[PDB]
Amino acid sequence: TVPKLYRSVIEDVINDVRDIFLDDGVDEQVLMELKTLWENKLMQSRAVDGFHSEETENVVVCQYDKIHRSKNKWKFHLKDGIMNLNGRDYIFSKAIGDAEW
DNA sequence: CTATAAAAGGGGGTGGGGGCGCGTTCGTCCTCAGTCGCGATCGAACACTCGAGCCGAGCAGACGTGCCTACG
């Protein structure tokens, strides 16, 4: 669920930045060095298992719809987020958060 | 202990008042036509002169009538 999105968006940004670099004048081997060392760093971080491998706190970043406060109680309407928990990573697109302050 | 409510303090915004600067209007300046005083000449009248002409007086005389004497 995570490497599928990572492969799709890394090939998306590669096939978009091809014209960006060749309109800024550099060799295609420089583009290849970008993608190659970028997957080297995904090897180095050692959190998700994928392709180039076979060849600090818990932060959740996201977006919100509404944060509601009924006096003590908080209600979070979070959406489109990438969680990093227990070392590993997960994705979500919706989250309801009940919070006692 | 944590949450909610109420109270107090601080900050911001709006309104009012005061001060300063722009604006207005009449008292004070600025010509300019109509008229006064004086020389300046001009026309009308007035005083003086001078001669032309007429009139009266005056005087010498003539042209007559009457009135009176030496000669035939």
Per-residue DSSP letters for A10-68?
Answer: HHHHHHHHHHHHHSS---HHHHHHHHHHHHHHHHHH-SS--HHHH-----EEEEEEEEE
Say which experimental method was used: cryo-EM
Distance (Å, whole) CA A98 – CA A36: 42
User: Ramachandran region of residue A87, left (φ > 0), alpha (ψ -120 to 50) or beta?
Assistant: left
Resolution in A: 6.8
Q: How far is the CA of A34 from the C1' of B27 (A)?
A: 94
Place of tokens 């076979």: A54
**In angstroms, rounded to a whole number, what is the distance separating the alpha carbons of residues A62 and A83?**
8
Q: Looking at domain A1-43, which CATH architecture does it have?
A: Orthogonal Bundle (1.10)
- The reply to whether A24 Cβ lies less than 7 angstroms from strand B is no
Q: Are A73 and A98 in contact (CB under 8 A)?
A: yes
